[PDB]
Amino acid sequence: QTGGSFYEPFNNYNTGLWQKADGYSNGNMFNCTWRANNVSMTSLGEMRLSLTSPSYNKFDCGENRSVQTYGYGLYEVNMKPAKNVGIVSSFFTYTGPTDGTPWDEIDIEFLGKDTTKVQFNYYTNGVGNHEKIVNLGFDAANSYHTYAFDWQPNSIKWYVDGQLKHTATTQIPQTPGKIMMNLWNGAGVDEWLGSYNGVTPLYAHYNWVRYTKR
Ligand SMILES: [Ca+2]
């Protein structure tokens, strides 16, 4: 890994820690194009991701990613996801083929269709299917909450406001990855996310991020 512990309050946009995806679509289930203009800072000290439309039936989305790689340790995010059918707001670690490594990823994803729930998942050497849906007891879209994952060699623990919500112990990822955040509308996954209805603009806000090395 190339990165160390850090605390990001989002008082400004630190180009030394982050970079914006721009000018391309992930393809597959992503029905939008990443644009640097879709990642911006608010006056209230927050990073905001947006889902907008530049023309008929075309969508623009946002993705923020870290410059360095991070390994084992505690990952915390204080955020508020977007609320709307057919979309996803997330916080995850990622590394893959493009980077010349196995596909190792750990996720925290909010299905816009129902913000009273949260989904946890992970990929190890490209193998996923570890989805775990948890009831939050509140509407994540209404206020800020702290979401976290403790990534250790033999286990992954997920928390909501300090409370342990789920643990994973098999086929734990090992490759350090970049910290990422995104907001997007899907296609071909109606059963999972619901059918996107074209409503824009939509926003996901990030208050602060923290990574504490092992
Ligand atoms: Ca802040």
UniProtKB/Swiss-Prot annotation:
Documented effect of changing E105Q: 0.2% of wild-type activity
SUPFAM superfamilies on file: Concanavalin A-like lectins/glucanases
Effect of D190N: No change in activity
GO biological process: carbohydrate metabolic process
GO molecular function terms noted in the UniProt entry: licheninase activity
Disulphide-bonded residues: C32-C61
Catalysed reactions, semicolon-separated: Hydrolysis of (1->4)-beta-D-glucosidic linkages in beta-D-glucans containing (1->3)- and (1->4)-bonds
Gene3D superfamilies: 2.60.120.200
Phenotype when changing D161N: 70% of wild-type activity
Keyword Protein biosynthesis: no
Catalytic-site annotation from UniProt: E105, E109
Further comment found in the protein's record: Beta-glucanases of Bacillus have a substrate range similar to lichenase of germinating barley.
PANTHER family, A to Z: XYLOGLUCAN ENDOTRANSGLUCOSYLASE/HYDROLASE PROTEIN 8-RELATED
Name of the protein: Beta-glucanase
Native source species: Bacillus licheniformis
